[PDB]
Amino acid sequence: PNIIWLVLEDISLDLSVYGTPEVKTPNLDRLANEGIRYNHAYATAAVSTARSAFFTGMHATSIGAQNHRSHLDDGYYLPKNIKMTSQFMREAGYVNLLMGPKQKTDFNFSTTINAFDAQDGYSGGAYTHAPTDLKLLERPAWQTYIKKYGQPFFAQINYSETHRTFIADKKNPIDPSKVKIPSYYPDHDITRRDWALYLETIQTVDQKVGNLFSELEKAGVLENTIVFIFGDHGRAMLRDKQWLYDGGLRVPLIVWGKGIESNQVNNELVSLIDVMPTTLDLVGLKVPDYVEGHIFLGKNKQKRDYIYAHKDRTDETDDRVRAVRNLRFKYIKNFYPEKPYNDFNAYKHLQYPVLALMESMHAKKLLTHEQALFFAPNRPQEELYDTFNDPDEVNNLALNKNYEEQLLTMRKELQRWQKATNDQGMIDETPEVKEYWDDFFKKHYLTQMRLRGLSPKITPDDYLIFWDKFLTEQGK
Amino acid sequence: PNIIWLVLEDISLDLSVYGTPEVKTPNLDRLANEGIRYNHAYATAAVCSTARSAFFTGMHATSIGAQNHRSHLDDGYYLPKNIKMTSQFMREAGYVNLLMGPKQKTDFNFSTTINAFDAQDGYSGGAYTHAPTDLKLLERPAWQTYIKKYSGQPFFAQINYSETHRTFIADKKNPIDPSKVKIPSYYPDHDITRRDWALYLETIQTVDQKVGNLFSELEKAGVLENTIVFIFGDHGRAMLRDKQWLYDGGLRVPLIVWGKGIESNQVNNELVSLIDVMPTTLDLVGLKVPDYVEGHIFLGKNKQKRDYIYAHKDRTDETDDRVRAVRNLRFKYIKNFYPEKPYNDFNAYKHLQYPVLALMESMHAKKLLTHEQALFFAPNRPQEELYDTFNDPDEVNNLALNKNYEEQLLTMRKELQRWQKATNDQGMIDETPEVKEYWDDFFKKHYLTQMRLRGLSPKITPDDYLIFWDKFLTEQGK
Ligand SMILES: OC[C@H]1O[C@@H](O)[C@H](O)[C@@H](O)[C@H]1O
Ligand SMILES: [Ca+2]
Ligand SMILES: [Ca+2]
């Protein structure tokens, strides 16, 4: 059986098959309907940390890759006991292909063995989405596989969508007045225009996914292939990506193809570190005891009580956050409660129009209570949400005595997990490394800003003048 | 006769002898009364390098290509061979030239192939730290060299103090009450403004004590009887609408002449530009002033009166601009060549060292500025500004659109164009992208760096910055 991991960038449960208004995702909805659709799939982090984790079946904090980005060129290697997905598939006789327009691995470590056997051939900043005519199968990775090999393939296929910059879809343009907006962003034309383009970027990648499956079926390789389709983490919106709310962690996960019964919906807890062990099992390999991920499909399935996630340094922004989630409750511990949520991060300021919208509205005291939570000068050390009653996780139960028992249960589960995994995010990075990235990113802001002809100290209201023009040029 | 140029940094007419309440400047007041005090001396620019390149040569910086603060530090651009430094004239006359005072900087926007000074004590960007008033300038290597190797010759000494550049320093012998300082109308009548202002005045008192110490040293050295001293600031005070700008706050400076042959109790109300100090010094020592020199001789038998003073503002650090001013005894004309740029164009120096800039950004957002204070915060500028400094000394009522002053407006506008043609104003020629992008990055870096060092976001809101500024000021002592 061939294996495909089709990885989408920065996307929440915003497909039409997941109940999202307005967006057209016919190809992905059809794959979901023809296989198993997972409603409770969670990444283990919300930015390199998500992909270092799911390529190894280990939380990035367990292998020292918690810091986005880190260990790029300092002689830090994967510990000998930790094998990459493709080392396992190689043993089983697979040839490993790196495909898709991206061509990146985003590991927070180096390797001494190749992650893939063939690829098309640093990925920071804003992405530009190429046209939907990309013939992925006529690129060097797939060309190499067909001409030099028998053997089955394991193929990771990375799409650039739905990363910023968002791209308009004029075949089926979206009405900003009709999209569904989480309660923690302002119901404002700036928000809805940015959000319409996010969903049009999902429509764009849906077309490309349709085009890929038409290429594969004309290859004759679909009959003996299982495809995992999943986001690496939630959508590129202000309180989603980087953070440990469901907007940042919950991702689409569809399992499709060889032997997979159709029209199934799964509501069990799945963490993205579960994809490697499940792939191993599907290919008839034993999962070594060290792997933290669970097998989630088939006779060897192993159910989860909880999923876990971390937030440590992101770009220049230093933080220390951990999450624990069962089916109902989200528990979040901020280890640095004195740091604001809105701690300076060039990426967010540079690419997110809604951040300027909310700093403008916050200064005028125009935010709702839910929207202003993110703009407090400090954080409570613990957050607890009843996601059944509060899916937008805006009502923190952690000081509510009515939930203290659940609070203590998950607090203690966090400690056990950290002890059991020897959480490396609990050790400080060196000053050298922190100051390097501070210098890397604080410069990134002032220059990309000056390039836009803007002052680094630009007021939110002036930035908003620029963003309204940015969005119009985008086409919304 | 010996000549001293005693140069104070960043100071307006904020001495007690000029009428400033609360500040105590007895030493500088005594010298004023014992000499000639000038009420209408103007720098040709409002930052250090362009004002100092100007007065050390007697030429407007725009006339010699030195108009961009900072420029030409290391590019093989030298002074035109026809333009001599003050010390080249002194040397011909037989002076030895000495660079004294805690500074030890020349701040030229050009390199030289001949040393500006014969002896010195041994880049002056950022914030300064004012040393204690126990400085013994004559025990430092420039004066020690002079007396050891150059006895028999008169000296020309330029004595640069660090005051009253930021960072301001408290004076605990005579601390100033912030509720009693006089604040111009274009700054908010606020506790932040007044505390920053008291510290500024207390810095004047600190350098005043140092001037009395220098003159007590000089008297003991037995050299004062054969010396003429020019005491002048290089440009006006380090406040938001003063330094860098062509209003009277950034251009008008104390000027005192004192010493041999200078009769006391004299007050002078004639227009004087700092490019006048060189030729007047040359004439005081018996040198003819070459015809090329733009400065006027303002003292003695060869006094040549001024109809106008001029001033320029081109690039200042990273902030590109192009402004010219013309002033007679009454009217100020100012032409903004880039009227689409705001006054508050980003300048890392201002945002980093000026608490009132954050104050006013916060009050502007809340619509708390008065009309006068809010003028600086417009999104663009009128191309011409005209002020009747007799009726409007704070220069806040722009008459350029008033029909009743069109005759004056066009007179001064034509005079500017005349001057630029006459002097071949080098600031009308754009700098290369390489230069502008070197400095934009040098200073854009500085800002984020110092903010992060301070523990602040480079995007910090004005109100959050005010919390920091309140602690900064308290830690300063006010
Ligand atoms: O950081 C650069 C700054 O350095 C100061 O010392 C100077 O007086 C300012 O005008 C500005 O150039
Ligand atoms: Ca991603
Ligand atoms: Ca100065």
Tell me the CA–centroid distance for residue B106 and ligand 3, in Å: 11
Give the number of whichever ligand sits closest to the CA of residue B8: 3
What chain A residue is nearest to B441 in terms of C-alpha separation? A447
Ligand 1 pocket check for B317: Cβ under 6 Å: yes
Nearest to A9 by CA among A263, A240, A190, A279: A240
CA separation, residue B454 to residues A67, B238, B353, B472 (Å)? 24, 21, 12, 10
Q: Is A443 on the interface with B (CB under 8 A)?
A: yes
Whether residue B321 contacts residue B335, with contact meaning beta carbons closer than 8 Å, is answered with no
Q: For testing the chain B interface, which of A339, A446, A463 should be mutated: the one with the most B CBs within 10 Å?
A: A446
Instruction: State the nearest Cα–Cα gap between A236 and chain B, in angstroms.
Output: 21
Query: Which strands form A321-325's sheet, in the order they lie side by side?
Result: A307-311, A321-325, A329-334, A382-386
Which value, in Å, is the radius of gyration of the alpha carbons in chain B?
22
Q: How far is the C-alpha of A184 from the C-alpha of A342, rounded, in Å?
A: 14
Q: How far is the C-alpha of B418 from the C-alpha of B424, rounded, in Å?
A: 10
What chain A residue is nearest to B460 in terms of C-alpha separation? A457
Whether residue A354 contacts residue A237, with contact meaning beta carbons closer than 8 Å, is answered with yes
Instruction: Inspect the interface and report whether the beta carbons of A447 and B452 lie closer than 8 Å.
Output: no
What chain A residue is nearest to B367 in terms of C-alpha separation? A364
Pairing assessment for the beta strands A2-8 and A153-158 based on DSSP bridges: parallel
* A176 secondary structure, DSSP code: G
Tell me the CA–centroid distance for residue B244 and ligand 1, in Å: 10
* B338 secondary structure, DSSP code: -
Ligand 1 pocket check for B51: Cβ under 6 Å: no
Q: What is the DSSP code string of B201-268?
A: HHHHHHHHHHHHHHHHHHHHTT-GGGEEEEEEESSS-SSTTSTTSSSHHHHB--EEEEETT--SSEEE
Q: How far is the C-alpha of B51 from the C-alpha of B165, rounded, in Å?
A: 14
Nearest to B320 by CA among B349, B351, B335, B341: B341
Q: Is A455 on the interface with B (CB under 8 A)?
A: yes
Tell me the CA–centroid distance for residue A333 and ligand 3, in Å: 51
Nearest to B197 by CA among B347, B366, B12: B12
Whether residue B183 contacts residue B189, with contact meaning beta carbons closer than 8 Å, is answered with yes
Atom of ligand 1 nearest to the CA of B10: 8
What chain B residue is nearest to A348 in terms of C-alpha separation? B459
Helix (H) or strand (E) holding A52: helix A49-54
**A-B C-beta contacts closer than 8 Å:** 42
Residue A298, number of CB atoms within 10 A of its CB: 10
B319 phi, psi to nearest 5 deg: -90, 110
Instruction: Inspect the interface and report whether the beta carbons of B444 and A442 lie closer than 8 Å.
Output: no
Nearest to B248 by CA among B311, B303, B198: B311
Residue A184, number of CB atoms within 10 A of its CB: 22
CA separation, residue B337 to residues A189, B223, B242, B313, B412 (Å)? 37, 49, 19, 10, 15
**B457 neighbourhood in chain A, CB within 8 Å:** 343-344
Q: How far is the C-alpha of A393 from the C-alpha of B107, rounded, in Å?
A: 59
Q: For testing the chain B interface, which of A457, A459, A463, A466 should be mutated: the one with the most B CBs within 10 Å?
A: A457
Residues of chain A with CATH 3.40.720.10: 2-149+151-305
Q: Angle between the B462-476 and B191-220 helix axes, to the nearest 10 degrees? A: 40
Whether residue A28 contacts residue A20, with contact meaning beta carbons closer than 8 Å, is answered with no
Tell the burial category of A439 from Cβ atoms under 10 Å away from its Cβ (0-12, 13-18, 19+): middle
CA separation, residue B326 to residues B67, B334, B407, B411, B418 (Å)? 16, 7, 15, 10, 11
Instruction: Inspect the interface and report whether the beta carbons of B441 and A455 lie closer than 8 Å.
Output: no
**C-alpha count within 13 angstroms, C-beta hemisphere, residue A346:** 21
Q: At what resolution in Å was this solved?
A: 2.1
What chain A residue is nearest to B464 in terms of C-alpha separation? A377
Tell the burial category of B305 from Cβ atoms under 10 Å away from its Cβ (0-12, 13-18, 19+): exposed
Pairing assessment for the beta strands B323-327 and B309-313 based on DSSP bridges: antiparallel
Instruction: State the nearest Cα–Cα gap between A354 and chain B, in angstroms.
Output: 15
**B361 neighbourhood in chain A, CB within 8 Å:** 459
Whether residue B4 contacts residue B228, with contact meaning beta carbons closer than 8 Å, is answered with yes
Q: Indicate the class that CATH gives domain B2-306.
A: alpha beta
Q: Is B458 on the interface with A (CB under 8 A)?
A: yes
Residue A118, number of CB atoms within 10 A of its CB: 22
CA separation, residue A349 to residues A168, A238, A460 (Å)? 21, 9, 10
Q: How far is the C-alpha of B355 from the C-alpha of B357, rounded, in Å?
A: 5
Q: How far is the C-alpha of A449 from the C-alpha of A349, rounded, in Å?
A: 10
- Best mutation site among B235, B240, B317, B318 for ligand 1 pocket (most ligand atoms within 8 Å of CB): B317
Nearest to A457 among B445, B452, B459 (CB): B459
Residue B155, number of CB atoms within 10 A of its CB: 22
Q: Is A143 on the interface with B (CB under 8 A)?
A: no
Q: How far is the C-alpha of A398 from the C-alpha of A383, rounded, in Å?
A: 5
Q: For testing the chain A interface, which of B445, B448, B456, B460 should be mutated: the one with the most A CBs within 10 Å?
A: B448
Q: Indicate the class that CATH gives domain A2-149+151-305.
A: alpha beta
Ligand 1 pocket check for B105: Cβ under 6 Å: no
Whether residue A270 contacts residue A315, with contact meaning beta carbons closer than 8 Å, is answered with no
Whether residue B315 contacts residue B277, with contact meaning beta carbons closer than 8 Å, is answered with no
Ligand 1 pocket check for B10: Cβ under 6 Å: no
Q: Is B346 on the interface with A (CB under 8 A)?
A: yes
Nearest to B48 by CA among B232, B238, B207, B235: B235
Q: Give one word for A474, left, alpha or beta, with left for phi > 0 and alpha for psi -120 to 50.
A: alpha
Q: How far is the C-alpha of A386 from the C-alpha of B94, rounded, in Å?
A: 89
Nearest to B188 by CA among B352, B377, B16: B377
Instruction: Inspect the interface and report whether the beta carbons of B448 and A457 lie closer than 8 Å.
Output: no
Q: Is B351 on the interface with A (CB under 8 A)?
A: yes
Whether residue B194 contacts residue B178, with contact meaning beta carbons closer than 8 Å, is answered with yes
- Cα–chain center distance at A186: 23
Q: How far is the C-alpha of A341 from the C-alpha of A337, rounded, in Å?
A: 9
Whether residue B96 contacts residue B146, with contact meaning beta carbons closer than 8 Å, is answered with yes
Nearest to A231 by CA among A69, A78, A50, A16: A50
Q: What is the DSSP code string of B15-34?
A: SGGGT-SS---HHHHHHHHH
Tell the burial category of A440 from Cβ atoms under 10 Å away from its Cβ (0-12, 13-18, 19+): middle
Whether residue B420 contacts residue B333, with contact meaning beta carbons closer than 8 Å, is answered with no
Sign of the torsion formed by the C-alpha atoms of B93, B94, B99 and B101: negative
Nearest to B205 by CA among B24, B13, B358, B426: B24
Whether residue A118 contacts residue A97, with contact meaning beta carbons closer than 8 Å, is answered with yes
CA separation, residue B438 to residues A98, B70, B317, B435, B443 (Å)? 41, 11, 10, 5, 9
Q: Which of residues 355-374 of B touch A (CB under 8 A)?
A: 361, 365
Q: Angle between the A189-217 and A353-363 helix axes, to the nearest 10 degrees? A: 160
SS3 A18: helix
Please count the residues of chain B: 478
Whether residue B271 contacts residue B328, with contact meaning beta carbons closer than 8 Å, is answered with yes
Q: Is B467 on the interface with A (CB under 8 A)?
A: no
* B69 secondary structure, DSSP code: B
Give the number of whichever ligand sits closest to the CA of residue A51: 2
Whether residue B473 contacts residue B355, with contact meaning beta carbons closer than 8 Å, is answered with yes
Which value, in Å, is the radius of gyration of the alpha carbons in chain A?
22
